[PDB]
Amino acid sequence: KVFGRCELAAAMKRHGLDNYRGYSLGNWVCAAKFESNFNTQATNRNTDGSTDYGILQINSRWWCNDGRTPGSRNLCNIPCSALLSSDITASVNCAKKIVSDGNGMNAWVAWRNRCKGTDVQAWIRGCRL
Ligand SMILES: CC(=O)N[C@@H]1[C@@H](O[C@H](C)C(=O)O)[C@H](O[C@@H]2O[C@H](CO)[C@@H](O[C@@H]3O[C@H](CO)[C@@H](O)[C@H](O[C@H](C)C(=O)O)[C@H]3NC(C)=O)[C@H](O)[C@H]2NC(C)=O)[C@@H](CO)O[C@H]1O
């Protein structure tokens, strides 16, 4: 599914992500836009042979099993495929872990380089939140 800017904002909120660990809702919609273009079916292979999965592009080297990344710790205890379904529940749940765990949202190269320090509130303008 390809979420609407506002529709996703709404959903991430409902899922308790607004201010989770101190990141405004906007920080999340932003990361997701540039990470996956609000498309949950998105995947991308990295050089190291891991693959990125979902709306938030969670990695298989650490967070989830897709059964063809070897070093693989599956800290999320989810098969990667799960992260691609139209309910974002599993992705949030896992994204929460990723972000708690030390580097905050820096863990998302995209967020860091294109989101960090821009007025991210602009992503949730218009929204009935
Ligand atoms: C080309 C590129 O930049 N790819 C991006 C992914 O990062 C590498 C560079 C890749 O895809 O080839 C990126 O995914 C992010 O990867 C890093 C590295 O594996 C993850 O950070 C590690 O996280 C664990 C646990 O949090 C730490 O133990 C590692 O130790 C560091 C040093 C730390 O001290 O925290 C972390 N590595 C480093 C060196 O920081 C990120 O968690 C991971 N991000 C996500 C989303 O899970 C993805 C994501 O946007 O994007 C590719 O483009």
From Swiss-Prot:
The segment(s) forming the C-type lysozyme domain are 1-129
Catalytic machinery residues: 35, 52
Q: Which UniProt keywords apply?
A: Allergen, Antimicrobial, Bacteriolytic enzyme, Disulfide bond, Glycosidase, Hydrolase, Secreted, Signal
Enzyme Commission numbers on file: 3.2.1.17
Disulfide pairs?
A: 6-127, 30-115, 64-80, 76-94
What molecular function terms (GO) are annotated for this protein?
beta-N-acetylglucosaminidase activity; identical protein binding; lysozyme activity
Q: Which reaction does it catalyse?
A: Hydrolysis of (1->4)-beta-linkages between N-acetylmuramic acid and N-acetyl-D-glucosamine residues in a peptidoglycan and between N-acetyl-D-glucosamine residues in chitodextrins
Additional remarks:
Lysozyme C is capable of both hydrolysis and transglycosylation; it also shows a slight esterase activity. It acts rapidly on both peptide-substituted and unsubstituted peptidoglycan, and slowly on chitin oligosaccharides.
Q: What is this protein called?
A: Lysozyme C
The organism's taxonomic lineage, starting at the top: Eukaryota, Metazoa, Chordata, Craniata, Vertebrata
